[PDB]
Structure formats: structure tokens, C-alpha cells
Enzyme design. Structure first.
Site, PDB file in Angstrom:
ATOM      1  CG  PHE A 235      -0.322   0.285   2.527  1.00 21.60           C
ATOM      2  CD1 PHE A 235      -0.126   1.579   2.986  1.00 21.60           C
ATOM      3  CD2 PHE A 235       0.072  -0.766   3.333  1.00 21.60           C
ATOM      4  CE1 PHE A 235       0.464   1.814   4.211  1.00 21.60           C
ATOM      5  CE2 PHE A 235       0.662  -0.537   4.557  1.00 21.60           C
ATOM      6  CZ  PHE A 235       0.858   0.753   4.996  1.00 21.60           C
ATOM      7  CG  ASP A 236       3.325   4.686   1.322  1.00 23.39           C
ATOM      8  OD1 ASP A 236       3.541   5.095   0.161  1.00 23.39           O
ATOM      9  OD2 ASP A 236       3.541   5.379   2.338  1.00 23.39           O
TER      10      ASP A 236
ATOM     11  CB  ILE B 163       1.459   5.558  13.217  1.00 27.05           C
ATOM     12  CG1 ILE B 163       2.495   4.792  12.393  1.00 27.05           C
ATOM     13  CG2 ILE B 163       0.365   6.108  12.317  1.00 27.05           C
ATOM     14  CD1 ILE B 163       1.898   3.709  11.528  1.00 27.05           C
TER      15      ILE B 163
ATOM     16  CE1 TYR C 166      -3.109   6.443   9.994  1.00 33.84           C
ATOM     17  CE2 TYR C 166      -2.208   4.475   8.981  1.00 33.84           C
ATOM     18  CZ  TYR C 166      -2.216   5.845   9.135  1.00 33.84           C
ATOM     19  OH  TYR C 166      -1.327   6.617   8.425  1.00 33.84           O
TER      20      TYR C 166
END
Lengths: 107, 63, 789, 48
Positions: A36-37, A56, A82
Site C-alpha cells: 500500500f505504500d 504513528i 489507525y
């Protein structure tokens, strides 16, 4: 918490201290194995200051324990990254994250 | 009959004259005489690499 | 799977990795820098041959060390392990090569390569004729004696030519031998051995099916002996006198019998030696019992074969002297142009060069060509075969003449006259009737494309004419007729597709000749079903073979492991599925279960012993094992386990119902038959995908039925496949769920660029070198449910 | 649901021509050993 496993050893003496800035290259994917990244796609290292709630919790705790030049892998539980809300459109709720981090330079 | 030599004759004319070849081919379609037709008036790259009457033959063989 | 080692890190420069393999009790082990790693593979399949391999991407440099003079080991091998360089076959030489390529680099351009022939593990076991019980006929006993006598004379002559002389005790330095005596003067045991050997030549001829019988009763008293000079005389007065067989000429059948006699002898000798524990090795070691010639006769060197054949041929001439008379599926590869290049008008030309002489085909094809049909066997292609001058379109016809190495075939198509012409080295090929065209009266349809087909071990070159100067026979025939090169005025090379022989699951066509799939709705007492039926069971053109069928959508296990009443059924997490086999279909030919996304076995002799499996074991430094996991790709049960004891075949007309249960929260899979439990069970790891699957062999008009039913307190399959139906206990079959069958071959696209890898012999001490530098990248599209790219 | 896309590298394999197997009555030995040495490697030549 976070689990750290070593991929490539580093200096072993220098560690990030208070007030410094870390420059890292990272790649993040979900637990299922879907990326995802990645900061290497944008061809620009990521830069952040430790202790100023910029990222985070798990990323900071993992980076705090790594030496200069070390390459390692970090795992973050949902309550650290998250939570149950997730990132709208990117990360589903209650997701466990896996990161591959290399520490390049300090300050 | 024996037209195995037609390519040898065709090799004599450069491709630029191709537009001529059909035109005279129409003149022989009108049963014109040879003298009047004589009076009535990447391929190139490969042609340059080497160191009229044909149209009558094609017109006759067209039958 | 993670392993523990002192100083764990990814592979880095100056690292040394040692690999050990034990065929006995399948075991593979690794060592890094001399420190062992704490994990092992075991319990894997043993069919086929094993070879070392290294896989890499761009930007690496490595060296192979194999021992001997091909690189010195940096560490001592374990006590019982042999270096790899000893495994080189006598007829081969050590080198580095890629694995199963279909393209190569050549001097004038790329070469296309067909399939490669390979050895099998059954080629290293000698199989003699085993003619022990055979006993020489009584009528061959005299000739056994005479044969032994002449064989002795010939043997003695060879020895004496090589400087051997008589002495009572053998001395190989002085070349003294006690057998340099008259045959009748040999010790009885030596005479008897010679007679036994002569008799076994005769018995082996008979076992090979030869007819051996007296034909010329005058021949024996017309025989003469060779008269050698006195320089061939031994000190005991013995001088050899072999028969003069100069007049004897082996017939072709007799030459063939000589050739056949030798192999059998070498094979039986090799089997006898193997029975005592000997083995093959490239270097001789008498105490280790390893010999450089302990291989079947087929793999021997030419010199050894001729040396073994010489004596048998001599014996054959001697015997003839006495007047006796003695009397798809990876087998081919197809390359073609892409569909976008189809031509519907004009006149076109291209060229094909045969580097090797063999089974190759070339011509024109329709856009909708099929990959699993031999080229030209149907109406979709027009092809010329050069191995044996033939033309193929819906059949085979004689045409042209055979080709040779380096020959060039030019293909021309004319869409104004609708004709196809083939030329060989600038000469037009013509049929027996004398017609210039090979094919005529062809309907244009959608167009035509260049196509070629290569057999096993063949190499060819294709030229579509991007550069006109590269063509060799275009100007000789074709230029003046008005034909053009296929790829003229193109900026980039033409894309090519090829036939890929990797089985894949595909949906059953709606108009298949033999199989029919039906969807059945659920009644008040039945669930929805998917039924399979055979269309042509009793006809003359019936097709009977194994069928591998699966469903379209998988189920997935969780990330972590830890009359219906709603409280139980709302949080059950257990799912059920059923299969019904009708009466008439033999339950001994049905396998039922689950498969993983990576099943690719199209086997026509399937059995539960053919399933791939492996075990990975992790241990500690002190020898205590922590875990052992089993990996496979097929979890099935066999119908024959549920047949009634002593059943008299399909005499009983009763249906069979097999049910499968899976627990997505614990990873446990179980089976039931006719409401009874079974002892078989399976355990899987988290995050696994499974597909329902059935393997069958039809024996009746009605074969099988998939049933998406439901048991008490157990949810149906639909509640696991679709997210919106997670809490719906009503079974259903949405349109996305359909049956699929396994296919052997498909089409694939060839890349435009390939990696450059350089290999060379680094040195006698350094070993062999492999190096890669230039990076390459591609854009990949991923299908998630099939886990495919 | 939707098809995914990414960028990936090419990989390739290399072997010698040594073959070893096991069967009933075979003529081959049962234990083998070999070694590989690494000289140079770039951890990140591309983004992967």
C-alpha cells in the site's frame, strides 16, 4: 507492541537521540501481502523528527531501536496504527501493518 | 508459350516509369500502331544499388 | 519460513553456501560459512532427476564450486557425501546452461528453439533379457566346442601379437601367461569356463530370437587355418591357428544380431556388479567400489562399445564359418504473428531458415488458430513440411523435396488470385501434376498470419523483412512479380505469440462436443445442484479420459486461529459441501476434495500416490525439534475406500453421497460418507485459499453432481464465498459460480527484451562464474481471486 | 474486485548439466554436495 527482526546489520553504536531528524526509506504492505505504500517509488527519502507526534506510534518505536545503516522489518498491531477507524480508502479497519525500514542518516 | 524471361525484361525499367507502363497499355487497347504509341507521350533505393515495348507484351499476354 | 542461524543476514558478498542432498531418506541440508542451519526438507517425491540451481535478478556475481579441478571447496564435505563433478556422464562435458528456453541469440539474429529431450531416472537401471532358464539345444553342443576352440586361438593370437609368451605363472610385467597352450591342454576348469562362455553366446543368440541351424554340410571340411610364422611359436610348441574366415560376410540381419548380442552382455554384467553394491563415478576408486563404466550400454563411449563389440563380431564370423545360417503436450511448439497484423489484401512474402534438419513446419494461419491441434491437421492453416516433402491443409499430400541444413524457404501469398507459393533456395516447388501453386481457391475470411512449428530439438530462424538487405532470395524470385516483405515500413519488430504448455483451469464451453453442464434449482426437499453429463457415451466416436473439474470461487481461512437454533448457527464458522455419484458410475474412479490455486498436473494415470507433498522441520541447536509442517496442493479422498466389502462391481444400483466439512477458524477439514464418519482429516495454515474439486473417469451416461446443501447447525457454502451473504443460512447459487475443467495448453506473449547473462570458466581454482548487470522491468496485472499475474 | 497493477523485475535461473536420481536397481550414488560463493550484489538496483 512492535516486533523487530533484523534483515541486514548496521553500525550497532549510533542510535537516534532526542532532537534529531531521521532519514529513512520504507515500504509498507498489509498483513495479507498487498503493498500500500513505498517511498522508493517517489525516489525521495522520508524525513521525520522523533518525539513530535509526526508519525504513528509503531513506526517511531521501531525506528528508535535501530542503528545507523541497519535494515529491519517491523510489525504493528491495529491498536498502534489507525485503530478501528483505518485510513479512508487506503487501509481497512482493524488492520495489522508490516514495514521494511532502512535507516540512512541522522539529523 | 515460353515466358520465363519476362523478369529479365522487367528488370530493365526503373520503378519511376511504372506510371508510364499502364498508360501505353491503354493505347494498345485502342488498336493503335506501334509508331503512334512511340510518338504519343524503398524500391528506388534497392534499384540504385545495382551497378514501352514491355507494355505490348503484357497487353498481348492479358488475353 | 524463518530459520535460525548464528549471525542471520541476507546473502552478502564473501558468503559461502554449501548444499547437501541425501537420496536415501529424502533429505536436503544447508550450511553457511561452516555453521549449520536449523531446518530441513524431507519426505518429498522421488520421481525424476535432481540438479542444482541458482536463481537471481539483475546485478549479481556468483561462482559455482563443484570440487576436483572445477573449483576447490572451502570446507570439508560431510563424511559420506561425494563431490558433484564425479557425476558427469562419459559422453558429455561440464558446462552452464539455462533451463527450458524457447529463444536464443544468433549471429544474424534471434533463433527459435523447440522442446528439448531429457533423460529419466529409469534410464540408469540395466534390464537384461534374463535368459537363464534357456539351455543350448543338443544339436548345438558340437558347435559350442568348436566355437570355444576358435575363440581361444583368436585370443592367443592377440596376446602373442602384443608380446605375450608362455609361462606357468602369470606375470603381467614380463607378459607371461599360462593359457598360451593348446585348448585341450588347458586346465579342466579353464576349458569348462571357455565352453560355458561359448554356450552362452549361443544361448544369447537364441534368446534374441535367432534361428541357428546347419545349412552347408561341406563348409567345415573346406575350412583352413591361418598359418602364422614361427615367430608366433611359444616355448612349449604351441602356435595359434585360428580359422581363416576371410571369405565370411555377415548379412545385415547378422550384423544386427552381433550389435544386439553385445549390449545384453554388458547389461547383465552391469546388473551383476550392481547387485554387489558397486556404483558409477567419473574417477576410479577400487576401495570405494566405484567404476567409470558402470552404466547401461546405451550411455557408454564409442571406443568402449567398439572394443566390446569386436570379440562378439569375431565369434559371429567364426560361427558363420561352419556353414550355419542365422536369421501437443510438450512434443511440439508453435509460434505465430499477433492478431493485429492480419492481412486481407495484397501480395506478401517472408523467409524461414532451417538450422537443423527435422520435423518442422511453416506457413500461413487463420487468426482463430487453436494451440492444441497439430499444425495443418484442420482447415485453419496452410503449411509446408520439409522433413519429408509434404503439404498440409485438412490432410497430408506429397509435395516438393526434402531440405538440408542452411536451406531457405520463401513463402508468398497472393490475395488477388488467392494462391500460396513456396520456394526453396530461389527455386519454385511444384507438385507431381506440375502445378506451380501449392494451394488455390482460398476464401479470404478474416486474414492470414505467419506461423511456424518446431519439434523436439529443432532450431530455426524467421525473417519477416524489416531490413530488405537482410533477405537472401527476395530479388531472385518475388521482387519483379510484385511481392512485398511482410514487415516493411515498420518502426518496431513484429510481436510474436507462442504456445505455452502449462495446464490451466477454464470454463466449459457452451457447445462442447462431449460434455454438458446443467444447473438444477432447489425444490422443497433438494438444494441447487450442478450436474455433469456425457453426450456421446455409446457412439463410435466416444471420447473417454480423465477429467479434472473445480469450482470457480475459493474459500479463505482467517488470519488468526483460536431445526436449527439461531444462537448456535449465527457464530458457527463451519461450512459443508456435498457430491453425489449416480448408480452406474464406478465409485472406484472418483476422487473428491479441495485444491489450491497452484495445481497444474494434467496426468492421465492419476493416483493418490502422485500428489506432491513435502515436510519442513525446524530444530534447535541441541537437537530438539520445535515444529514439523506438511505442505501439499491437493486434499482429496478416494471413492474405493467407501465401497461395500466384497462388492460385486457395479451390480448394486445405489447412489453414493460424500460430504466435506471445513472449519475456517481452526484449519480442520473432515469428510463423511453416507452419514458415517471417516478416519481421514487434514490441517492447514492460516490465510489459505481452497477450491472444491472432483477428479473423475466417466463410465456411464450420468456421472456426478455438485450439491451446495446444508446440514444442521452448519452454514452452506454460499455464506463463505460472498460477503453480503455472511449471515444468510439459505443456500443459493449465484450466476458467478460455475464449473471449470483443466486444459493442457494456451497462448502466451513473447517479451520484447531479455536479460543478458554471461558465463565462463573462471578458473581451475576459482570455479565457474555467473554475472548479471543490466536491469529490466515490466508492468504486471494481477487477478486477486485466482492469485495470478 | 478490481484488477491490480504494479511494476516488477525479471528473474532467471542457471544450472549445470549434472543430473542425479534414485530408483530400484539404479547405478547411481546416493549422497551429493556442492558449494556457491557470492562476489558482488547491489541491494537496491531498482525500487524492488
Amino acid at each position: 507492541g512492535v516486533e523487530i527482526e533484523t534483515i541486514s546489520p548496521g553500525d550497532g553504536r549510533t542510535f537516534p537521540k532526542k532532537g534529531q531528524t531521521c532519514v529513512v526509506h520504507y515500504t509498507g504492505m498489509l498483513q495479507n501481502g498487498k503493498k500500500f505504500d513505498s517511498s522508493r517509488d517517489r525516489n525521495k527519502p522520508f524525513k521525520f523528527r522523533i518525539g513530535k507526534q509526526e508519525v504513528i506510534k509503531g513506526f517511531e518505536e521501531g525506528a528508535a531501536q535501530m542503528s545507523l545503516g541497519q535494515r529491519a522489518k517491523l510489525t504493528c498491531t491495529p491498536d498502534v496504527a489507525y485503530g478501528a477507524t483505518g485510513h479512508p480508502g487506503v487501509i481497512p479497519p482493524n488492520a495489522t501493518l508490516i514495514f521494511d525500514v532502512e535507516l540512512l542518516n541522522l539529523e | 508459350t515460353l515466358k520465363k524471361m519476362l523478369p529479365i525484361g522487367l528488370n530493365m525499367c526503373a520503378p519511376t516509369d511504372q506510371e508510364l507502363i499502364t498508360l501505353a497499355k491503354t493505347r494498345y487497347a485502342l488498336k493503335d500502331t506501334d509508331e503512334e504509341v512511340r510518338e504519343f507521350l524503398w524500391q528506388m533505393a534497392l534499384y540504385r544499388g545495382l551497378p514501352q515495348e514491355v507494355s505490348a507484351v503484357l497487353y498481348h499476354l492479358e488475353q | 519460513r524463518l530459520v535460525t542461524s548464528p549471525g542471520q543476514h541476507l546473502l552478502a558478498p564473501e558468503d559461502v553456501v554449501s548444499c547437501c542432498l541425501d537420496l536415501s531418506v529424502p533429505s536436503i541440508s544447508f550450511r553457511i560459512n561452516g555453521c549449520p542451519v536449523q531446518g530441513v526438507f524431507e519426505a518429498f517425491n522421488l520421481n525424476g532427476l535432481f540438479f542444482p540451481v541458482v536463481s537471481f535478478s539483475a546485478g549479481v556475481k556468483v561462482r559455482f564450486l563443484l570440487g576436483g579441478r572445477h573449483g576447490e571447496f572451502k570446507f570439508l564435505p560431510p563424511p559420506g557425501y561425494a563431490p558433484c563433478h564425479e557425476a558427469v556422464l562419459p559422453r558429455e562435458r561440464l558446462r552452464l546452461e539455462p533451463i527450458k528456453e524457447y529463444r536464443r541469440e544468433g549471429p544474424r539474429g534471434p533463433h527459435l528453439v523447440g522442446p528439448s529431450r531429457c533423460l529419466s531416472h529409469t534410464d540408469f537401471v540395466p534390464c537384461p533379457v534374463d535368459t537363464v532358464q534357456i539351455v543350448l539345444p543338443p544339436h548345438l553342443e558340437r558347435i559350442r566346442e568348436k566355437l570355444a576352440e576358435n575363440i581361444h586361438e583368436l585370443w592367443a593370437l592377440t596376446r602373442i601379437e602384443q608380446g605375450w609368451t608362455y609361462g606357468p605363472v602369470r606375470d603381467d610385467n614380463k607378459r607371461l601367461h599360462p593359457c598360451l597352450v593348446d585348448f585341450h591342454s588347458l586346465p579342466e576348469p579353464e576349458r569348462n569356463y571357455n565352453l560355458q562362455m561359448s554356450g552362452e553366446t549361443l544361448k544369447t543368440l537364441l534368446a534374441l530370437g535367432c534361428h541357428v541351424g546347419m545349412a552347408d554340410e561341406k563348409a567345415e571340411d573346406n575350412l583352413r587355418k591361418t598359418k602364422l610364422p614361427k615367430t608366433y611359436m611359444m616355448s612349449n610348441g604351441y602356435k595359434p591357428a585360428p580359422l581363416d574366415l576371410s571369405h565370411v560376410r555377415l548379412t545385415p540381419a547378422q550384423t544386427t544380431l552381433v550389435d544386439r548380442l553385445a549390449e545384453n552382455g554388458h547389461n547383465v554384467w552391469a546388473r551383476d556388479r550392481v547387485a554387489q553394491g558397486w556404483s558409477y563415478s567419473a574417477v576410479q576408486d577400487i576401495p570405494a567400489r566405484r567404476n567409470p563404466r558402470l552404466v547401461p550400454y546405451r550411455l557408454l563411449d564409442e571406443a568402449t562399445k567398439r572394443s566390446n563389440r569386436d570379440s562378439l563380431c569375431q565369434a559371429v564370423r567364426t560361427l558363420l564359418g561352419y556353414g550355419y545360417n542365422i536369421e501437443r503436450w510438450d512434443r511440439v511448439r508453435i509460434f505465430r504473428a499477433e492478431k493485429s497484423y492480419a492481412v486481407q489484401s495484397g501480395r506478401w512474402y517472408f523467409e524461414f531458415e532451417a538450422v537443423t534438419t527435422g520435423e518442422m513446419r511453416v506457413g500461413w494461419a487463420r487468426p482463430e488458430l487453436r494451440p492444441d491441434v497439430e499444425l495443418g491437421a484442420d482447415e485453419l492453416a496452410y503449411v509446408f513440411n520439409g522433413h519429408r516433402g509434404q503439404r498440409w491443409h485438412l490432410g497430408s499430400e506429397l509435395f516438393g523435396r526434402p531440405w538440408q541444413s542452411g536451406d531457405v524457404v520463401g513463402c508468398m501469398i497472393d490475395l488477388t488470385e488467392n494462391t500460396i507459393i513456396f520456394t526453396l533456395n530461389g527455386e519454385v516447388l511444384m507438385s507431381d501434376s506440375g502445378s506451380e501453386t501449392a494451394f488455390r481457391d482460398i476464401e479470404v475470411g478474416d486474414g492470414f498470419l505467419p506461423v511456424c512449428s518446431l519439434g523436439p530439438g529443432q532450431v530455426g530462424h524467421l525473417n519477416l523483412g524489416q531490413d530488405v538487405s537482410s533477405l537472401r532470395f527476395f530479388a531472385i524470385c518475388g521482387l519483379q512479380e510484385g511481392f512485398e516483405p511482410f514487415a516493411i515500413n515498420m518502426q518496431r519488430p513484429v510481436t510474436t505469440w507462442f504456445s505455452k504448455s502449462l495446464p490451466q483451469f477454464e470454463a466449459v464451453p457452451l457447445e462442447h462436443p462431449h460434455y454438458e453442464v446443467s444447473r438444477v434449482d432447489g425444490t422443497v426437499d433438494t438444494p441447487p445442484c450442478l450436474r455433469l453429463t456425457h453426450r456421446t457415451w455409446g457412439s463410435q466416436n466416444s471420447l473417454v479420459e480423465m477429467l479434472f473439474l473445480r469450482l470457480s470461487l475459493p474459500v479463505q481461512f482467517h488470519q488468526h486461529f483460536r431445526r436449527d437454533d439461531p444462537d448456535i448457527i449465527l457464530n458457527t464458522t463451519t461450512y459443508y459441501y456435498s457430491v453425489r455419484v449416480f448408480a452406474g458410475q464406478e465409485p472406484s474412479c472418483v476422487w473428491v476434495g479441495w485444491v489450491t490455486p497452484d495445481y497444474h498436473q494434467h496426468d492421465m494415470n492419476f493416483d493418490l500416490t502422485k500428489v506432491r507433498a513435502v515436510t519442513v522441520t525446524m530444530g534447535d541447536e541441541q537437537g530438539n525439534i520445535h515444529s514439523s509442517l506438511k505442505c501439499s496442493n491437493c486434499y482429496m479422498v478416494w471413492g474405493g475406500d467407501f465401497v461395500s466389502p466384497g462388492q460385486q462391481g457395479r451390480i448394486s444400483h445405489t447412489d453414493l453421497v460424500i460430504g466435506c466439512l471445513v472449519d475456517l477458524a481452526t484449519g480442520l477439514m473432515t469428510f463423511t460418507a453416507n452419514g458415517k464418519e471417516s478416519n481421514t482429516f487434514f490441517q492447514v495454515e492460516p490465510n489459505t485459499k481452497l477450491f472444491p474439486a472432483v477428479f473423475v473417469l466417466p463410465t456411464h451416461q450420468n456421472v456426478i453432481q455438485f450439491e451446495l446443501g446444508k446440514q444442521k447447525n452448519i452454514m452452506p457454502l454460499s455464506a463463505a464465498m460472498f460477503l453480503s451473504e455472511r449471515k444468510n443460512p439459505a443456500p443459493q447459487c449465484p450466476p458467478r459460480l460455475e464449473m471449470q475443467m483443466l486444459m493442457p495448453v494456451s497462448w502466451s506473449r513473447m517479451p520484447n527484451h531479455f536479460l543478458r547473462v554471461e558465463t565462463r570458466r573462471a578458473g581451475e581454482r576459482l570455479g565457474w562464474a555467473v554475472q548479471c548487470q543490466e536491469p529490466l522491468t515490466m508492468m504486471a496485472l494481477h487477478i486477486p481471486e485466482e492469485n495470478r499475474c | 474486485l478490481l484488477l491490480q497493477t504494479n511494476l516488477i523485475n525479471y528473474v532467471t535461473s542457471i544450472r549445470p548439466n549434472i543430473f542425479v536420481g534414485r530408483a530400484e536397481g539404479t547405478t547411481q550414488y546416493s549422497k551429493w554436495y556442492f558449494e556457491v560463493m557470492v562476489d558482488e550484489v547491489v541491494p537496491f538496483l531498482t525500487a524492488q
